[PDB]
């Protein structure tokens, strides 16, 4: 396939990718920016804590109506939330990206996450029933995921 | 064209709905029902002065 | 309607004939662009209604 920002030391960087996975886009974007640049030891350790609700994910661009929380003071921000299923699938890709780092023969604990893109997928449609016998649509918003992992030299 | 630029049958809703005053086909279920009927500016309308 | 006449049981016999999916060898022929049965009918949503 093709990635945005094909890497600059390509033999010394492993990559992983996900397409058409049923989650919410706007939740998966904000947790990608929390990830971006963090070491993969800490990328494992941070996303266990979001599912344990011990450490937040700040909502920076898609902020409408998110309540305040205590733990956005690690991020210089007010509004945080604790997405399970964003963290469930984004912890998944890091083990797939660990798996590719194994096969190419890298030093897998020098790996930082260089680039991570999350962009909307062809959305699947359902319908629900409002008043007066008027259908209004009720649709998913899945997202495609890419990531590039580059050694800190 | 000669005929069957508009085989269809439609009358217009008019006022109390926010749409427009193009004729709209009569029925339901089949999702052409409710669309724009004959005239120039519609899908499946006739042309302007159908050539003779 | 749980007790009925014979004309309906001939009509209902054919509608269960129609109502089975596509085998996986017609799908792999030559001269083909059928992907599924579009005339497939499910009894909660779409009644036949005689």
């Amino acid at each position: 396939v093709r990635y945005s920002l094909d890497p600059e030391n390509p033999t010394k960087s492993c990559k992983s990718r996900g397409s058409n996975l049923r989650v919410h886009f706007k939740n998966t974007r904000e947790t990608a920016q929390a990830i971006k640049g963090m070491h993969i030891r800490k990328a494992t350790k941070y996303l266990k804590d979001v599912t344990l609700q011990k450490q937040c994910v700040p909502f920076r661009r898609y902020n409408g109506g998110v309540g305040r929380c205590a733990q956005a003071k690690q991020w210089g921000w007010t509004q945080g939330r604790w997405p399970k299923k964003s963290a469930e699938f984004l912890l998944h890709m890091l083990k797939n990206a660990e798996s590719n780092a194994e096969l190419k023969g890298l030093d897998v604990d020098s790996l930082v996450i260089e680039h991570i893109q999350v962009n909307k997928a062809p959305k699947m449609r359902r319908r629900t029933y409002r008043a007066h016998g008027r259908i209004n649509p009720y649709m998913s918003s899945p997202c495609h995921i890419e990531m590039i992992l580059t050694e800190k030299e | 064209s000669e005929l069957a630029g508009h085989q269809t049958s439609a009358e217009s809703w008019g006022t109390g709905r926010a749409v427009a005053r193009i004729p709209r086909v009569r029925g339901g279920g089949t999702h052409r029902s409710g669309q724009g009927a004959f005239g120039n500016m519609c899908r499946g309308g006739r042309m302007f002065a159908p050539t003779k | 309607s749980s007790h009925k006449t014979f004309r309906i049981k001939r009509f209902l016999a054919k509608k269960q004939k129609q109502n089975r999916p596509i085998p996986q060898w017609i799908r792999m022929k030559t001269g083909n662009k059928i992907r599924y049965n579009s005339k497939r009918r499910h009894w909660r949503r779409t009644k036949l209604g005689l």
Binding site: R125, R126, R127, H132, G133, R134, I135 | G16, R17, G28, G29, T30, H31, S33, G34 | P21, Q24, R35, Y36, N37, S38, R40, R45, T46
Partner: peptide
């Protein structure tokens, strides 16, 4: 392998107009 389900035709129906008629100005 199975064909995608649903996505059936709508069939919009008539609904009440001019909200609560109420009383016209006079």
């Amino acid at each position: 392998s199975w064909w995608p389900l649903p996505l059936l035709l709508l069939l919009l129906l008539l609904l009440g107009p001019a909200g609560a008629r109420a009383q016209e100005d006079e």
